[PDB]
Structure 1
């Protein structure tokens, strides 16, 4: 009886404490107590990358797209990728909530 879990949202907002999560995650993955210049550390090792990126995805809830996976050469690239937000609101949704002038009215038929 495999029951499909409820569909997840495809919008992501960077947490304020993202830095704390990332530094803790790096320490847990390798156990070096965050050596200085941690961001510069590369992800060349296959196992290293999988443990780090997969762990962040489980907690944060967003995973690196396959297209952007290769460009995650260093931890800094991984950190930057999570920082940028992801919005599921369509450009129409912005118009609806933009508080347009009264003379402008929009009705959605879809």
Structure 2
């Protein structure tokens, strides 16, 4: 009765309306609704951090790495962490879509 879900891609692209989704999650926080020093709000609270990060990851689709977890002391890097894109395209894939000249031939034998 246990069926494995399909593997999900590791590529995450920042939403165009990142602030709108971001402030929506900040509103999800208990009464914050973009308060004073919103970017400087401390995340040291375990329960608040879990709720905020968990909700953001599900909606935005990007999750804080365990190794990078402790750097997420305040919001400022949370917004920065989500706004930096992540691409699953391989180097060969990027090279393929790089206006290859007519005399250059690439074949993937793997």
TM category (shorter chain) comes to over 0.9
| 1:94 Cα offset (Å) | 1.1
| 1:32 Cα offset (Å) | 2.9
- Which residue is equivalent to 1:21? 21
SS in structure 2 at match of 1:105:
strand
| 1:33 Cα offset (Å) | 2.4
TM-score w.r.t. length of structure 1: 0.95
C-alpha distance in 2, partners of 1:105/1:97?
A: 13
| 1:23 Cα offset (Å) | 1.0
| 1:84 Cα offset (Å) | 0.2
C-alpha distance in 2, partners of 1:33/1:84?
A: 24
C-alpha distance in 2, partners of 1:7/1:101?
A: 35
C-alpha distance in 1, partners of 2:64/2:22?
A: 14
C-alpha distance in 2, partners of 1:95/1:32?
A: 45
TM-score w.r.t. length of structure 2: 0.95
| 1:58 Cα offset (Å) | 0.6
| 1:36 Cα offset (Å) | 2.1
Which 4+ residue blocks in structure 1 deviate beyond 3 angstroms?
none
Aligned Cα root-mean-square deviation (Å): 0.9
C-alpha distance in 2, partners of 1:48/1:108?
A: 48
| 1:6 Cα offset (Å) | 1.1
Q: Deviations over 1:40-59 (max 9, x none)?
A: 11101111111101100010
